[PDB]
Amino acid sequence: SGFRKMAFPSGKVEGCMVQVTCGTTTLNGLWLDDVVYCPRHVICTSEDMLNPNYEDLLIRKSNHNFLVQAGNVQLRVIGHSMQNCVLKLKVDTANPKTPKYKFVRIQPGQTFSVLACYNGSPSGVYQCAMRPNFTIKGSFLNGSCGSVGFNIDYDCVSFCYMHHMELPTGVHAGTDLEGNFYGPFVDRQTAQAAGTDTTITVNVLAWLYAAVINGDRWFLNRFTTTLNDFNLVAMKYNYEPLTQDHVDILGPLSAQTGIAVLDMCASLKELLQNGMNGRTILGSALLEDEFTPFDVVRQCSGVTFQ
C-alpha cells in the first residue's frame, strides 16, 4: 500500500494565518477567535536583534502600531500583551474560520505538521519531529517566522510549535504557543548551537513495524532480547533509551503484526551492529526516526479528518 512522510491536511490552519507588520518588520501570525499570536520580535528592527530588550521595545508601542492583514482585509488591533516570547494581539474581529483547537507542549520524539508561511500566506506543508535536542529539521527562509506546527485529531487542531529561528547547522528552534522555547534557546541573534542529537528509538521501531506491514521483512531475525540488553547496545549508537512506556505504546503494532516488541528490538540490535548491507527498508537506506507509533497506525489504518 506504500508508506510516505504524510502531513496533516492544512486547511484548518491555513484559515488562521495572517501577516503582522510593526514598523518595517513583517512576519506571520495565528488568528484564533479575536486574538493574533506572533513572535514578539515583530517589534524589532535589524539593530535590535543582536541584544533586544523586549519589555523596553514594547512599552514604546501602542495598538495602532501593529498592522494585521488577513488577505487584504486589515484587522483593527485593540489590545496587546507579551507572554514569554510571543505577542498576543487582541483584534476587534473574531476569525470565523477558527477551528476547535488547543495549545499543547509536545515532548521530544513527537511529530507534527509545519505549515511554512511567508507574508501571512501558505507556502507548503511537511512533517517534522521534535528532536531530543529540542530542534526541528525544518525548511524555513527569511520571513517564515510565526509559521506554526500542529497535530489534528478529528476536528481538533493542537498547535504545538511557532517558528522563531535557525541554528548553526541548518536546523530550527521555536516556542509553544505560550511563547516558551523548546530547548535552551533565546530569541536573540547571538551564538547558540543545539546539543548533540540522538535517534528516537521508539520511532525507529514503529517504522520497522510499518515495513513489516508493507511486506518489507528481510531484516527480521529469529532472536529476542531483554530491554536492558537492547538498551546497552542502543546507547553505543546514540539511540534514546527505550522505556516501558515506549514498549507499551508499541503494543498496537506489536499485536497487529504478531511480532513482540523485544523481538523487533532484537532485529534492530542486529541492524545497528551489522548495518543494512546496501539494502533498503521502505525505499530508505537509513533507519528513519520521524514516524511515531501513532503516525504508523494512522497511515496504515486510514484515520481521517486528521
Ligand X SMILES: *[C@@](O)(c1nc2cc(I)ccc2s1)[C@@H](C[C@H]1CCNC1=O)NC(=O)[C@@H]1[C@@H]2[C@H](CN1C(=O)[C@@H](NC(=O)C(F)(F)F)C(C)(C)C)C2(C)C
Q: Please report, as ranges, the residues that interact with a copy of itself according to CB under 8 A.
A: 1-12, 14-15, 115-119, 121-126, 128, 137-144, 166, 170-172, 214-215, 280, 283-286, 298-306
Q: 9-28: which residues touch ligand X (CB under 6 A)? A: 25, 27
143 binds ligand X, rule: CB under 6 A: yes
CB of 235 to ligand X, least distance (A): 29
The residue length of the chain stands at: 306
87, 42 contact by CB (below 8 A): yes
Q: Which of 109, 120, 138, 143 is catalytic?
A: 143
The yes-or-no answer on residue 117 being catalytic is no
* Number of CB atoms found within 10 A of residue 270's CB: 16
Which partner in ligand X, a copy of itself, none is near 137 (CB below 5 to 8 A by kind)?
Answer: a copy of itself
For the bound state, the minimum distance from the C-beta of residue 254 to ligand X, rounded and expressed in Å, comes to 24
Q: Least distance from C-beta 224 to a copy of itself, angstroms? A: 29
Residues 6+ apart with CB under 8 A from 85: 39, 40, 41, 54, 164, 175, 179, 180, 181, 187
Distance CA 150, CA 70 (A): 20
187-226 residues near ligand X, rule: CB under 6 A: 187-190, 192
C-beta of 122 vs 252, nearer to a copy of itself: 122
Binders of ligand X: how many residues, by CB under 6 A? 26
The residue (of 27 and 86) whose beta carbon lies closer to ligand X is: 27
- Evaluate whether 187 touches 197 at the Cβ level (below 8 Å): no
Amino acid making up residue 196: T
Classify residue 241 by its DSSP letter: P
- Chain-centroid distance, C-alpha 194: 16
- Amino acid identity of residue 288, one-letter, is E
User: Can you tell me which of 41, 80, 88, 131 binds ligand X, judged by CB under 6 A?
Assistant: 41
Could you give the CA distance from residue 106 to residue 182 in angstroms, rounded to a whole number? 9
CB of 149 to ligand X, least distance (A): 13
Does the active-site annotation cover 64?
A: no
Q: Which amino acid is at 69?
A: Q
For ligand X, the binding residues in 152-181 under the rule CB under 6 A are: 164-168, 172
Judged by beta carbon distances under 5 to 8 A according to partner kind, the member of ligand X, a copy of itself, none in contact with residue 167 is ligand X
Q: Return d(Cα 136, Cα 139) in angstroms, integer.
A: 9
Nearer to a copy of itself, 170 or 184 (CB): 170
Contact partner at residue 126 from ligand X, a copy of itself, none, CB < 5 to 8 Å by partner kind: a copy of itself
CA 148 to CA 176: how far, in whole Å? 9
Q: Are 267 and 225 in contact (CB under 8 A)?
A: no
Which active-site residues does the annotation give? 41, 143, 145
Residues that bind ligand X (CB under 6 A): 1, 25, 27, 39, 41, 44-46, 49, 140-145, 164-168, 172, 187-190, 192
